[PDB]
Amino acid sequence: VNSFSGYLKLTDNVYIKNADIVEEAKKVKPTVVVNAANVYLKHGGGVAGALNKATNNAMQVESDDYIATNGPLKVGGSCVLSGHNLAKHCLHVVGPNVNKGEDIQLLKSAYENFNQHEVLLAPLLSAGIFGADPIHSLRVCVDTVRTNVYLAVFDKNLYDKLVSSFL
Numbered sequence: 394v395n396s397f398s399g400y401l402k403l404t405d406n407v408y409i410k411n412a413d414i415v416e417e418a419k420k421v422k423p424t425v426v427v428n429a430a431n432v433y434l435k436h437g438g439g440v441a442g443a444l445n446k447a448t449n450n451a452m453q454v455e456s457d458d459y460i461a462t463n464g465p466l467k468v469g470g471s472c473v474l475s476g477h478n479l480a481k482h483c484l485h486v487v488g489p490n491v492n493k494g495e496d497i498q499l500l501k502s503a504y505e506n507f508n509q510h511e512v513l514l515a516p517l518l519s520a521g522i523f524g525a526d527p528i529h530s531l532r533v534c535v536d537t538v539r540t541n542v543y544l545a546v547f548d549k550n551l552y553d554k555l556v557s558s559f560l
């Protein structure tokens with residue numbers, strides 16, 4: 394038993410809720426919150442901009458030091474950094490950005506990072522401003538992640554569509 398509430402169960406291990414991931418993170422304090430990162434960890438908008446804003450820019454400060462030491466992530470890759478006031482840890486995961494021409498096949502590789510963590514609060518990778526079809530992203534999530542994932546979907550209209558079309 395864990396503290397996530399109001400989720401609809403899609404599979405053995407995948408759950409989904411219409412929620413703001415920032416508000417869900419601040420209430421749950423999960424062990425891991427996933428950020429929809431880019432390779433530079435520049436948290437300007439979308440989920441990343443919202444998570445970073447909720448940390449009062451501390452996420453960005455930590456991220457800039459990470460990049461200065463390690464260089465950019467790979468598309469499909471990840472790194473574990475602090476969760477600041479939102480979670481114990483933040484798993485920054487880079488899904489492909491269709492608005493940058495990145496290969497959508499890398500979405501499966503991106504979701505594989507989730508398997509290194511027993512439980513995660515996460516957004517749909519490559520959705521929103523990353524330009525992928527969220528229904529496809531949900532399918533890849535279900536078919537790739539084996540650990541317990543709690544998906545927060547900000548848009549109520551999208552949440553209802555994800556649910557109604559789920560196979």
Ligand SMILES: CC1(C(=O)NNc2ncnc3nc[nH]c23)CC1
Pocket residue numbers: 413414415439440441443444446547
């Ligand atoms: C959770 C998410 C998002 O953008 N939430 N909305 C807002 N977040 C932060 N400050 C806001 N001020 C008005 N709306 C705001 C999808 C990334």
Ligand SMILES: CC1(C(=O)NNc2ncnc3nc[nH]c23)CC1
Pocket residue numbers: 412413414415439440443516517520521522527545546547548551
């Ligand atoms: C329609 C929409 C979506 O479905 N997911 N993105 C997000 N998911 C969870 N929390 C978020 N806070 C800001 N954007 C968020 C916003 C792009």
